């Protein structure tokens, strides 16, 4: 159902997030909270940025 009245706020509601990039797919009903930095291409980023 629509939940605009509480969740949304002006200027950007950044409380809830999502994984834009993952190394693999997801098994059903599996919760991932690793939130670890992901590297693409030549995966050279062993650091932070």
């Amino acid at each position: 159902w629509n939940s605009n009245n509480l969740d949304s706020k002006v200027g950007g509601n950044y409380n809830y997030l999502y994984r834009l990039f993952r190394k693999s797919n997801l098994k059903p009903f599996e919760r991932d909270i690793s939130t670890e930095i992901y590297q693409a291409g030549s995966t050279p980023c062993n650091g932070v940025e």
Partner: antibody
Amino acid sequence: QSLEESGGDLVKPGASLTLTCTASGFTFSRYYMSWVRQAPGKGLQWIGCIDNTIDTTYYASWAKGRFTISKTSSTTVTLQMTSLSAADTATYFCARGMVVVDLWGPGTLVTVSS
Amino acid sequence: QVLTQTPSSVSAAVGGTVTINCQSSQSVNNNDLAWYQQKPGQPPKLLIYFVSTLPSGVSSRFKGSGSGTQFTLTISGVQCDDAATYYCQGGFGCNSGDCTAFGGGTEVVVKR
């Protein structure tokens, strides 16, 4: 983040007119939009609104069939008007949102006279 | 579908609390009422939305009450710069009583 309207000019009654508000810094495909009018000596009233999926259906009851709203491209939305009357004189603001709005453009007045 | 702004005109002082009543003919859709302050010659600015939730970047003086058919706005004080007409933007369960509506103006004057 800004909006700017265009197309306000003196036009005889019964002639079609094209209005247009353009979005700067963002595209009219994520943020809700609305079309509103404010007469110089009368309250504010809304006419049309469309964003994302086809949403043009929502129109004012008094507006009837002479009011249509369509976005020509991603950043510009045009307004088409028919059957102009002396009671249609008002200031046209490009609202941003159906029930809640953040910021509008300066507003282009469209006066109707013969 | 037309929302009545009772009273149409409201007068208050700088340190005097401000109240206003906006009544809706029909029940609103899931608390979708909004409020905008329309300074003359310029489109209105947001002050309170969803009855009571405060937008980001506005003064901490506007608080809203009521739900369903009756709603009200309460302002703790005025810094003489809030002289504008307030429009209670009534979201409706759309396709019934139009799809949304705007009420009448309610400007606040300050006597000095």
